Amino acid sequence: VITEVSGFVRFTDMIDGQTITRQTDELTGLSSLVVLDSAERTAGGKDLR
Amino acid sequence: TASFDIEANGKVYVEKGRRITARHIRQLEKDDVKLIEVPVEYIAGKVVAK
């Protein structure tokens, strides 16, 4: 998903709990905010890509 | 994926937002946790039978 310009990265229209879930990697340590699809989340975050 | 806090006897078993894993099932089975409190928003998704 490489970019073209250089700068900072922020979260836009990314509400935790609905748009993204907290899945911490156990056996590695380097956790990441796993972005889910439109099927798992409800209508509260379905219209918020 | 429990949208509320599944807790009983003052002990938190499933946090609000965390999905139910196998360890939560083992805790709820070994501790014999049957009765819990649910919010009013959870029943809106259910379908009455009778």
What CA–CA distance (Å, rounded) separates A48 from A14? 8
Q: What is the CA radius of gyration of chain A?
A: 13
Give the CA-trace dihedral at A34, A12, A47, A25, to 10 degrees.
10
The one-letter amino acid at B39: P
CB-CB neighbours of B14 under 10 Å: 20
Residue B7's SS3 state is strand
Cβ atoms of B39 and B31 closer than 8 Å? no
Give residue A10's Cα distance to chain centre: 11
Q: Which of A5, A23, A12 is nearest to A48 (CA)?
A: A12
Name the residue with tokens 């990265």: A9
Q: Which residues of B touch A (CB under 8 A)?
A: 1, 17-18
Residues in B closer than 8 angstroms to A40, CB to CB, are 1
Residues in B closer than 8 angstroms to A22, CB to CB, are 17-18
